[PDB]
From Swiss-Prot, chain A:
Modified residues (Phosphoserine): S236
Residue ranges of coiled coil: none
Main location, first listed in the record: cytoplasm
Identification of the protein by name: A1 cistron-splicing factor AAR2
Other known facts: Present with 7330 molecules/cell in log phase SD medium.
Top-rank taxon: Eukaryota
Organism: Saccharomyces cerevisiae (strain ATCC 204508 / S288c) (Baker's yeast)
Curated annotation (Swiss-Prot), chain B:
Miscellaneous section: Present with 468 molecules/cell in log phase SD medium.
Compartments in which it is found: Nucleus
Segments for region (RNase H homology domain): 7-237
Subunit structure: Component of the U4/U6-U5 tri-snRNP complex composed of the U4, U6 and U5 snRNAs and at least PRP3, PRP4, PRP6, PRP8, PRP18, PRP31, PRP38, SNU13, SNU23, SNU66, SNU114, SPP381, SMB1, SMD1, SMD2, SMD3, SMX2, SMX3, LSM2, LSM3, LSM4, LSM5, LSM6, LSM7, LSM8, BRR2 and DIB1.
Function summary: Functions as a scaffold that mediates the ordered assembly of spliceosomal proteins and snRNAs. Required for association of BRR2 with the spliceosomal U5 snRNP, and the subsequent assembly of the U4/U6-U5 tri-snRNP complex. Functions as a scaffold that positions spliceosomal U2, U5 and U6 snRNAs at splice sites on pre-mRNA substrates, so that splicing can occur. Interacts with both the 5' and the 3' splice site, as well as the branch region. Has a role in branch site-3' splice site selection. Associates with the branch site-3' splice 3'-exon region. Also has a role in cell cycle.
Notes concerning its domains: The MPN (JAB/Mov34) domain has structural similarity with deubiquitinating enzymes, but lacks the residues that would bind the catalytic metal ion. Contains a region with structural similarity to reverse transcriptase, presenting the classical thumb, fingers and palm architecture, but lacks enzyme activity, since the essential metal-binding residues are not conserved.
Part of the full-length chain shown: 1836 to 2069 of 2413
Originating organism: Saccharomyces cerevisiae (strain ATCC 204508 / S288c) (Baker's yeast)
Highest taxon, organism lineage: Eukaryota
Protein name as annotated: Pre-mRNA-splicing factor 8
Length: 300, 237
């Protein structure tokens, strides 16, 4: 069980840790989050009480180093930093724990929600989508644009999701225009799975990371990426059976976790209606169709 | 974006453009089977590809053999149209290739956009105009070359005959759309108006009769009257 200590909390802020969140008051003696499950990526996220604009946060994995949060009064945000001195860090955490100034990662033993949302997500893949190679953790916020959004403007602060474009030479083989447009199996299986992602695990990891950035930061380009990766599978007649079964489980936990009040902005009517009712895979997503029909029947 | 009444003069500027109408590509007769079910029999069709500035018509004849053993023909017809327009563009020298293609039906946008990915600088546009190009097969000489075809064929026409010697492209397009609108609304009556006087003939190298400027005014009047009458009937007004 790992710990992310905080130097202090000088500004009032809502703090997120994965799917959980806590309000901290201005100068409240808050010194961090303990009992964080080893074996998963995590995200620690912020929304200032005085500017609810710019949700921002840090993807990290406690196996990769000792991370802490410290407020920067110049840049006006909570920053993640790595502590390279192991003994200094152990001594800081032990003190804050002894003084019980840390919130406990509030995991219910029965509850596989975080594992289910992050099953294929790997820190090394996050660090290639979010490029800042001097840090082992990755900063994301509400406003960061994707490589695809930029093409259609600061490259260093972009989300480098894999570009998916149904009306592109990459998606359409010369001489198979109608076949490749109506059945995206060659784009899914040859170009994306064999060509770019190498395997379905990397494809699902990116899909899962896009959804979590959409949900936790209201990142609009992430939401576009999540829907494009769903639509590419649903619009393919030929998908490995294990991939369809796994996609149904992934989407089920995503729809289950989504705040009921955000369905209006986080879910694309056209994509979901097409995926569940018109697509090749209309009958392949039993769990997802049942939760969507019971939780969001308006959308459909 | 979309071509409408507001940007109408753009049709007659010096940027090469083509209209594409796919409404006569897939044509059928519906009939009863021996067992009393219904079946279709395809007949020859055509792509209507027109330069509105010059009157040059690229009439690609669609022979019934292209449907043999295919499924979902109304869908395939849009893709086959897009394939043939793309092939026509690649066959033209660069300086003759259009800068825009306007499709008369929005269902042609994705098929044509996907077939033209190699031409990112050619804009594919819809139109809000309700153009009567479906009535092309009411022009006897176009109907005749389509029905007689025994294989895929491209035939080139000037749909304005020699009108551009005397009138502007704008006026020639206005005349063509009025003729086609009349032929579409009441073909028999339209055809009677065009041929009633036996002294005015169609030249071997022309589609329409050799009307004087004064005779075209009378004809154009007779076509507008046909259209309004028919409209008062259609709607009881």
């Amino acid at each position: 069980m790992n710990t992310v200590p905080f130097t202090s909390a000088p500004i009032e802020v809502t703090i997120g840790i994965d799917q959980y969140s806590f309000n901290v008051k201005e100068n409240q003696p808050f010194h961090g989050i303990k009992d964080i499950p080893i074996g998963h990526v995590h995200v620690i996220h912020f929304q200032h009480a005085d500017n609810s604009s710019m949700r921002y946060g840090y993807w990290f994995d406690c196996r990769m180093g000792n991370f802490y949060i410290q407020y920067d009064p110049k840049d006006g945000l909570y920053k993640m930093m790595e502590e390279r001195d192991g003994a200094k860090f152990e001594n800081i955490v032990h003190n804050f724990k002894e003084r019980q100034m840390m919130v406990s990662y509030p995991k219910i033993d029965e509850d596989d929600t975080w594992y289910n949302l992050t099953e294929f997500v790997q820190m090394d893949k996050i660090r290639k989508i979010v490029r800042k190679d001097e840090n082992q953790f990755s900063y994301v916020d509400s406003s960061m644009t994707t490589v695809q959004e930029n093409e259609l403007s600061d490259p260093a602060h972009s989300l480098n999701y894999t570009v998916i474009n149904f009306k592109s030479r990459e998606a359409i083989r010369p001489g198979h225009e109608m076949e490749d447009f109506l059945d995206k199996s060659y784009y899914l299986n040859t170009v994306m799975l064999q060509g770019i992602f190498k395997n379905s695990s990397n494809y699902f990891g990116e899909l899962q990371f896009a959804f979590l950035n959409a949900m936790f930061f209201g990142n609009y380009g992430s939401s576009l990426q999540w829907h494009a990766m769903i639509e590419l599978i649903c619009s393919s007649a030929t998908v490995p059976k294990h991939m369809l079964d796994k996609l149904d489980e992934i989407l089920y936990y995503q729809i289950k976790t989504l705040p009921e009040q955000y369905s209006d902005i986080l879910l694309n009517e056209r994509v979901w209606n097409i995926c569940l009712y018109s697509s090749f895979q209309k009958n392949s997503l039993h769990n997802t169709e049942k939760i969507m029909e019971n939780k969001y029947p308006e959308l459909l | 974006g979309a071509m409408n009444s507001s940007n109408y003069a753009e049709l007659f500027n010096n940027d090469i453009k083509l209209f594409v109408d796919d409404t006569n590509v897939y044509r059928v007769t519906v009939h009863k089977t021996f067992e009393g079910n219904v079946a279709t029999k395809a007949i020859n069709g055509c792509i209507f590809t027109l330069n509105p500035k010059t009157g040059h018509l690229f009439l690609k004849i669609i022979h019934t053999s292209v449907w043999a053993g295919q499924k979902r023909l109304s869908q395939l017809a849009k893709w086959k149209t897009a394939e043939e327009v793309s092939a026509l563009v690649r066959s033209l020298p660069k300086e003759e290739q259009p800068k825009q293609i306007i499709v008369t039906r929005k269902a042609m946008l994705d098929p044509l956009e996907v077939h033209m990915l190699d031409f990112p600088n050619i804009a594919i546009r819809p139109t809000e105009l309700r153009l009567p190009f479906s009535a092309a097969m009411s022009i006897d000489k176009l109907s005749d070359v389509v029905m007689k075809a025994t294989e895929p064929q491209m035939v080139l026409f000037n749909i304005y005959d020699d009108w551009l010697d005397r009138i502007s492209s704008y006026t020639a397009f206005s005349r063509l759309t009025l003729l086609l609108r009349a032929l579409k609304t009441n073909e028999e009556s339209a055809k009677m108006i065009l041929l009633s006087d036996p002294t005015i003939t169609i030249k071997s190298y022309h589609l329409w009769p050799s009307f004087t400027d004064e005779q075209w005014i009378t004809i154009e009047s007779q076509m507008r009257d046909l259209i309004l009458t028919e409209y008062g009937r259609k709607y009881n007004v």
